[PDB]
Amino acid sequence: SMTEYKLVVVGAVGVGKSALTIQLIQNHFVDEYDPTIEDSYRKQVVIDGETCLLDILDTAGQEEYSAMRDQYMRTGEGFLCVFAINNTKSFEDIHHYREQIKRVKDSEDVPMVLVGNKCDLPSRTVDTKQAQDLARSYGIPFIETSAKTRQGVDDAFYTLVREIRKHKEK
Amino acid sequence: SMTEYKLVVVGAVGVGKSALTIQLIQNHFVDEYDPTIEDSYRKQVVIDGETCLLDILDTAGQEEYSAMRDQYMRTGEGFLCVFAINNTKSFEDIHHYREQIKRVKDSEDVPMVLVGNKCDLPSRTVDTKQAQDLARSYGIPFIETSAKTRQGVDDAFYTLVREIRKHKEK
Amino acid sequence: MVNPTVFFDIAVDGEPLGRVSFELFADKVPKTAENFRALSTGEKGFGYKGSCFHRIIPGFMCQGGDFTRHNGTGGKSIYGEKFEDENFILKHTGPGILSMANAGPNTNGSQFFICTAKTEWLDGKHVVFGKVKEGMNIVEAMERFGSRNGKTSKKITIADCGQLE
Amino acid sequence: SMVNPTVFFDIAVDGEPLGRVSFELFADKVPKTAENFRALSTGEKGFGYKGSCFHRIIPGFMCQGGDFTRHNGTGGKSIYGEKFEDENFILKHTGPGILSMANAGPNTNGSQFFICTAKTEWLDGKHVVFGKVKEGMNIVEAMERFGSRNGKTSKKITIADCGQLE
């Protein structure tokens, strides 16, 4: 039998939420930017020998519409929290997402993965160590990804599935 | 605040599952048949003064692929069980859909609404009393609809949300 | 003087749908009205003619005006790529209000939106500078081509545009 | 083949040539079903596949087409009438390139067919297998890329020409 996972991709405008999702789902990348309102995808995959149905909600980076954003967090089972390694403000924003998820879920233990995207670009402004230390302080995994080269894309989503499994089986 | 409900539309091939869903989401109807593989939609509504997001999974009428169909029922919170009032076999098929939902969800009390669609047509073979009697034996509501005229479309989906909310009170 | 009026002839996959005209509130928002007026006539050598209403969300608005990248990300004003928020005197009071799209404070270019409902949460963030005069029924038709995520079911364009006497 | 006919499709994407796919039809084992597909490919009865669309393409599974009557994935007709019976289940859906009849349940073969892009063994005993791709599996692989999870195609994939090869 299979198992379904409700993943939600969050992070600041332009960090690559959609590009990551499209690489996972459709195995391609383009430079052209299509700003998101809201998109949802379903994909069957095998993770660690188990058949999984991934439901992925690709959210917009904008920060308004708290009623809708809160509902995304209430329904979601795990959160891919994305910043870009060449966008310092997007990294500084990350703690807002952790705070909002903990507030809406009323818990300090929510499945989440910190993702430093655009790791192919030679314009880094956020050091890997800074992000590793922040994730360690939250008790969550951290991975660097590139939606362009595909580095880490499957691993980021599969790690999030593994975090949800651990939380549900605890 | 808001809530969200996962609604799943089931029933035999050709009964009007998609036409009903398209009326709710896109406010139109065409006579052309577009056989479903699988489609999902989202809509924000207010029901009994309470705002909610409706996630609607529009399933195919076919009965194979039990692993996928079981997953549809595990994740779904309420089911529209649709037959057509001019298709006696589709009415006879209803008990199968219901037994499957009960077994997958391990419960005799799952939110569901019996929907008798195509009530605009002059070729009825299932009378209202037959359907009301079946719905009464299940302890669920019966709603007659026409996706063509839009009669009962909102009522069918809103009634299902009401059934989910009643179930959650237990 | 009399606020200027401009028109858009809206098309659906190239076929005429109808005309929408707008009053531009030059009396209250002169710099922003003048940008939209000039982009509607094309007199600077660039502007709205041919561009798409790329984002239409039923219940909210029809957004368009990207004549530089043709993909919802671009646009430019007659003053440069961007210009400052002129004032917030006018509000998003109901259907037909014409307001500037933006990416945050002081980033007005060419993209704009026509409200199809009151959108009061945008007050103080988006500069309102005009309203539909004739053709709300055409805006209502445009709205039916939209969807939750703004993607349109057919391509909605400004086939012609200009200034009325 | 010394016994089985070969037919071809010239596939187009929004009218642009993509390539040719040819098929061996297993008339030796499935004669009635093979003969239907052959005659629909030559158009010799006055109707057939030329111009029709691959309306449902699902990557990892199959490319389905053959509705030349309703032109929307609901129709079909055979050279024997609107429908004909399942002839036999001798052959199985063993892998990419298998050509098999689409249907709406038992004994409802018409003209719709599918080309497998993977093994689809759960269809064995329910869909009549009657041929296989001979040349042009790379073209089928290229068609598969215009599909999606719900079968809808991003561009219109058509049989621009078709016929029988000696």
Ligand SMILES: CCn1c(-c2cccnc2[C@H](C)OC)c2c3cc(ccc31)-c1cccc(c1)C[C@H](NC(=O)[C@H](C(C)C)N(C)C(C)=O)C(=O)N1CCC[C@H](N1)C(=O)OCC(C)(C)C2
């Ligand atoms: C949470 C879902 N969600 C909703 C929402 C809220 C409540 C209920 N239901 C929903 C939707 C239906 O649930 C899927 C909204 C909404 C809006 C956005 C993203 C998600 C949203 C969103 C995304 C990008 C840009 C903007 C908004 C502002 C935008 N700017 C640009 O497009 C610039 C361009 C000018 C350069 N770009 C491209 C960048 C990146 O800045 C702009 O000025 N306007 C002009 C004014 C209406 C506004 N668009 C817009 O579309 O609001 C849609 C709206 C009203 C429904 C709000």
Ligand SMILES: CCn1c(-c2cccnc2[C@H](C)OC)c2c3cc(ccc31)-c1cccc(c1)C[C@H](NC(=O)[C@H](C(C)C)N(C)C(C)=O)C(=O)N1CCC[C@H](N1)C(=O)OCC(C)(C)C2
């Ligand atoms: C549960 C989701 N789901 C899946 C599935 C299973 C496992 C994993 N993931 C999925 C999908 C990806 O999850 C979204 C399938 C699938 C198939 C259907 C519906 C839903 C499905 C479906 C729907 C209508 C008709 C048919 C299948 C049979 C059909 N007949 C007609 O089209 C006739 C026509 C000939 C007159 N019509 C129109 C009617 C009504 O009968 C037919 O002969 N074939 C030729 C053989 C492959 C087959 N189509 C087909 O498309 O299989 C798709 C397939 C292989 C992915 C299975």
Ligand SMILES: Nc1nc2c(ncn2[C@@H]2O[C@H](COP(=O)(O)OP(=O)(O)NP(=O)(O)O)[C@@H](O)[C@H]2O)c(=O)[nH]1
């Ligand atoms: N080099 C590189 N570019 C990337 C990468 N990921 C995204 N981009 C680029 O960054 C831009 C924004 O990407 P996108 O996925 O749309 O960002 P988003 O976070 O979904 N934005 P929004 O909040 O508007 O939905 C695009 O031009 C895209 O090609 C990456 O890993 N490497």
Ligand SMILES: Nc1nc2c(ncn2[C@@H]2O[C@H](COP(=O)(O)OP(=O)(O)NP(=O)(O)O)[C@@H](O)[C@H]2O)c(=O)[nH]1
């Ligand atoms: N007169 C009338 N026709 C209807 C009504 N609802 C659906 N139809 C028609 O019945 C046919 C099948 O409808 P559709 O919604 O596709 O059925 P479905 O249950 O989704 N079929 P599937 O199982 O293949 O997904 C179409 O031709 C549609 O126009 C209705 O209320 N009245």
Ligand SMILES: [Cl-]
């Ligand atoms: Cl906004």
Ligand SMILES: [Cl-]
């Ligand atoms: Cl099937």
Ligand SMILES: [Mg+2]
């Ligand atoms: Mg995005």
Ligand SMILES: [Mg+2]
């Ligand atoms: Mg359907």
